[PDB]
Write a protein that binds this DNA or RNA. Structure first.
Lengths: 282, 282, 282, 282
DNA sequence: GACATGAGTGCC
DNA sequence: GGCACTCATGTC
DNA sequence: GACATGAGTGCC
DNA sequence: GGCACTCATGTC
C-alpha cells in the first residue's frame, strides 16, 4: 500500500537474516521476502507488513486498519528500522575495504526505543538466541494480544512493565537485578527520561543512560546504536568484538576504531559480519 | 508528492489561519491553499509543502530532494502538525455542544518538540504577532539557510542555541532570563532531557519541565499541548481563559474543565476560539 | 562529686518543672531538688545526678562509675542542658520588662542532639504529656538497659532506630510519616548529616533540616533552640505563640520579634511563660 | 584549677612531643611540663593550660577568666585532645606485642574538628614543620587576638575563613586548590555539613568527606582519626605507612591491619613511631 | 555484562 | 596526596 | 508569564 | 505539625 524509497545497494537478505535471528515469537514474523509485526502507537494498534521491491528499489508498507490514523508515524518507524536514509556510496567510500564485501549493509534500527531498551538489557551476557527466547517470554506474560490478529501480540508497554512484580520477571529466567533494570527503564519511559529519539549529544546521553541501574557502557552503546540509530558508535566491550581484536583492551579497540569516524556503527556491523576479520598486519 | 489521509470534517481554513498568525518569516509560508516550511531532520534539510485535498479527504505532501532520504519522518512530522489521527465524531461525540459549531477543529501540533519549546518560551507575555516577529529574528541569527532554497531558513538547532551568547539573544528583544531559558532548553534537548515525544505520564513530565529556568505551569501545559500534542490538558492560567471564566480561579476553572475529559485540549481550542463563550450555571 | 558554677539568679523551680513535664519514664527522674537520668557517651554508660546548690550558686554532678572515663563530656553535656554559661544580666538587660517577672529563666538545652531531634519530632501536634508518653514507649522498645541500674534505660541510639521497622514504631501510637521521620533522622545522625553542635549559620542549617522528611519549619526552629541551644530564634509558627499574638500572621509576629534580637530564643521563652502578655498595637 | 583523671600508663613525653612538633606559633605553647593554647567557645575566649600530674594520674586544667562561663566544654575539649578516656589495658590487651614497648601511647585528638580539618588539609604533601608554619600564617592573617594575652591568637573561625580571598591564602604558600579546599571546608562548617563530632558510621561519613574538594581518602582518614578521635581507622595511603609495609599495596596493608580491630588507630600510631618495624613474614 | 574494588601512572 | 583514566578481579 | 514570598485550606 | 496545593501580590 504505502511506498518508500531507498538508495541502492541494499542487502535485504542480510537485514532480514539479522532480524530473523533476534525475532520475537508472536511479535514479529520474518521471511526472505518480507517482514511483519505487531505495532502500537499510543492507543492505536495493528500489524505492519514490509515488502521490499528490489528491481524498483522501493519498500511497500501495509497497515491493518487500526494503524491507519497514525499511518505516517508507522512509516517513520519502519524507515528507522530499515535505515532507508543511508547513502551507501558515502559510507562505503569512507570505510573502504572493510565494507567492499557487503556494500548493501544497513544499520538495523528499532520501531520503538523503549522496546529496544528492553531488548538490549535482556541481551546482556546471554546468546542472541537466548535473548530472543527471554524477550519472547516477557512479551508473552506482559504483552497485549491484537483483537484483529490473535496470532500476534504487542510488545509489553511501558506502564505494564513498570507495574510488574520483580519476582515474576525473575521467574522468566533472569537475575533479580535484570528485572529491576527493566522496571526502572519502563518508568524512565513513562516519565520521558529515556530519550526516545536520537539526542544531539549522543555521548552525553549515553553517560546519563549509564546512571540507570542495570545499564552499563555496553548496554548504553548498543542501545544508542539500535535504539537511536546512532551512526558513529563502536562496541569495544562487545563479546564478539573482543574476539575480533585478539588480546586488545577496550581503550585499544576504541582508539583503533577511531579510523572509521564518523561511521563507527557501520564499521562495527561489518566486523561482526566478516567471518575472519583481524586488525591490519601493520 | 506523497499523500496522507484524514477523517472529515476538517476545518482547514481555521487551521491554516492559526498557523498563519504564528508563521515565522523565512521559515514558514502560509496561504489559504497550502502550508510550506523549511525542515531539518538530522543533517538532512529541505522544504516541505502541504496541500490539502478536500475533494478526497487527503493531504498531499511534497518534499525537496534533500529530504527525500528521510521522507517517512517528514510525513510523520506533518501528520503531528496537522493532527491527521483525529476522529472528530469521537471528540465531538464527547464534547457535545461545545464542539458542535466548529466540528472540524484540530489540535495544531509542531514539527519538532525543541522548536515548539522555543516558541512557547518566546510567546510568554507578548502578543502573538510579536512572538512571531521575535522568533523570526532568532531564526534569522541562528538558522541554517538552505542552499537548494535560499529564500528559506531552517529553525535554529539545540547545538546552535546552546552555544549562544545570552546577551546576543537578549539584544533581539527579550529579557535576559528568557534568553537563558532558551539556552537551557537547548542544552536539555542536546542531552535527551527534553521529551521529544508524548511521554506515558504527561503530568509527571510537565512537572519536571517546570523545574527548567523560565518555564512555569502555563508554559509546561502549552508545551505539552502543542509540543507533545497531548489531548487532555487545559490551560487554566491562560490570560484569555481567565476572561472566558469570569472571576474564576485556576482551580475552579480546572475543576470545571474536568467535564471534557479525556479531550480537554480540544475543549481548550474551542473555548479559545469562541469569543463571548461563558460557562453554565453548573 | 564534680561541681559546676553559675551566675545568679537561676530559677531552678522553673527549670526542673519544665524538664519534669517532659520527662521520659525510665530515662529520667526529676524531683524538687535534683535531676537524674541515664547517659550514654559512646559505649560508656551510667547514670548522671545533678544537684543544684542555690546557697553557693553551684551545681553538683555525680557520675556512675561507667561514665567516669568520659567525665568532662558528661559535665559539658550537663552545662548545655542547664545553660550554665548564661549571663542573666545581659539577657534580662537586653529584654527589659518581658524578662523581669523571672530573670532566672534559662534556656533548657538537651544532653544529646539526636535525642532532642527525636523529642522534637515526637513533640509534634500532641500535648507535652502525650509527647513524653509517646517518647517513653520508644525508649522502652529500642533503648539500652543499664546492668547496674535495672530501673533506668538509655535513650535509643541512632543505630537502633535506623534499623527499626516503620510499622513497629507506628504501632506505638504515631502516624507512619512520623516514624519514617525518626528512621530518617537516625540515618542522618549515623551518617554525620545531623549537626550535633550549633553551626555558625543557624539559618542555613535549619533550612537544610527542613528538607528532612517529617521536619517542617516549626520542628527545625524548636530543634535549633533546644538541640543547639541557639539563643536567637523565635517560633512564629508555634501554637501558644499564635495565641500570644492574636490576629497576626507568622511574618508579622516575626517582624515584631526582631526587637528582641539577638536574644529571641529567650524572649520566646518568657512570652511562652507569661499568660497575660500581649503585643503593643503599634 | 580543674582536675581530670586518666588511667595509667600515659606516655606524656611522647604526647607533648607529638603536639610540640605540630605546634602553631601564636596559637599554642608546648613545654616539657605543660601544654597551652588559645581557645574560643562561642564569644568566650581565653587561654587554656594543661599540666599533667604523674604522681596522682591526673591532668590539671587552668582557664583564663574569659572561658569560665563555658568551663565544662573547655574541660571536655581537653579530654578529647589528650585521650583521657583511654583504658590502656584493653587496647594493649588487643594489640599484643605491637604496643608492648609503649603501653602509654595515646591518640592525639583535637579541640575542634573544623580546626583539625584545616590542619589535615594544610599538612598535605608537606613536612610537619612546614605545615606548622604554613598554618601559623593562616592563623595570624585571619585570627582573633586575645586582649588579655596579646601573644595569643584564636584559630580562624569558619565564618572568617569562608570569606577569605582565595588568593591571599595562595600567597601564604599553598596551591590554589589548597585554599579553595579551606574555603570549602569552612562553608561546610557554617552550614553544619562537616560533622563536628564522631558519627555512628565512620566509613560512610568518610566517604562523604571525600567528595569534598581537596579532601581525599588520606585526609578523610587522618581527619577521622584526629578530628573525631575515631579509634579504628588505618592510613594505608600514608607515605610513612607504605615504607613500614615494604612493597604491599594499599589494599594489602589494609587487610593486614584488620588483625588489630577495633583499635586500628592505636595500631597505626604504634607503627608510625616504631622505626625498624616490619610485618610478620608469615 | 553490571558494578564496586583495587593497582598505577603523570601532572598540580 | 588530589585527582582523572584505565585494566584486573570476583560475586551475581 | 516566571517566580519569590506569604497566608489559607484540607488531608495525612 | 508536615506538606501539597491554592490564591493573592509585588518585580523583573
Amino acid at each position: 500500500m504505502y511506498t518508500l524509497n531507498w538508495q541502492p545497494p541494499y542487502d535485504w537478505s542480510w537485514m532480514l537474516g539479522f532480524l530473523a535471528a533476534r525475532a520475537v515469537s508472536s511479535v514479529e514474523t520474518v521471511a526472505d521476502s518480507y517482514y511483519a509485526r505487531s505495532l502500537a502507537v499510543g492507543e492505536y494498534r495493528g500489524v505492519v507488513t514490509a515488502i521490499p521491491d528490489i528491481a524498483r528499489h522501493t519498500l511497500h508498507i501495509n497497515l491493518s486498519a487500526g494503524l491507519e490514523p497514525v499511518a505516517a508515524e508507522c512509516l517513520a518507524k519502519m524507515s528507522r528500522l530499515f535505515d532507508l536514509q543511508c547513502n551507501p556510496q558515502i559510507v562505503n567510500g569512507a570505510l573502504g575495504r572493510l565494507g567492499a564485501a557487503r556494500p548493501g549493509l544497513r544499520l538495523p534500527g528499532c520501531v520503538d526505543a523503549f522496546e529496544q531498551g528492553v531488548r538490549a538489557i535482556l541481551g546482556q551476557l546471554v546468546s542472541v538466541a537466548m535473548a530472543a527466547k527471554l524477550t519472547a517470554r516477557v512479551a508473552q506474560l506482559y504483552g497485549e494480544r491484537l483483537d484483529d490478529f490473535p496470532e500476534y501480540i504487542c510488545f509489553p508497554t511501558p506502564q505494564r512493565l513498570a507495574a510488574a512484580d520483580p519476582q515474576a520477571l525473575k521467574a522468566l529466567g533472569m537475575p533479580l537485578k535484570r528485572a529491576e533494570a527493566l522496571i526502572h527503564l519502563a518508568n524512565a519511559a513513562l516519565e520521558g527520561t529515556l530519550p526516545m529519539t536520537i539526542p544531539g549529544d549522543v555521548e552525553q546521553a549515553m553517560k546519563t543512560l549509564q546512571t540507570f541501574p542495570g545499564i552499563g557502557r555496553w548496554t548504553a552503546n548498543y542501545f544508542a546504536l539500535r535504539g537511536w540509530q546512532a551512526k558513529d558508535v563502536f562496541l569495544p566491550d562487545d563479546y564478539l568484538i573482543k574476539q575480533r581484536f585478539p588480546g586488545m583492551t577496550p581503550a585499544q579497540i576504541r582508539r583503533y576504531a577511531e579510523r572509521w569516524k564518523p561511521w563507527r556503527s557501520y564499521a562495527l556491523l561489518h566486523i561482526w559480519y566478516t567471518e575472519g576479520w583481524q586488525p591490519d598486519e601493520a
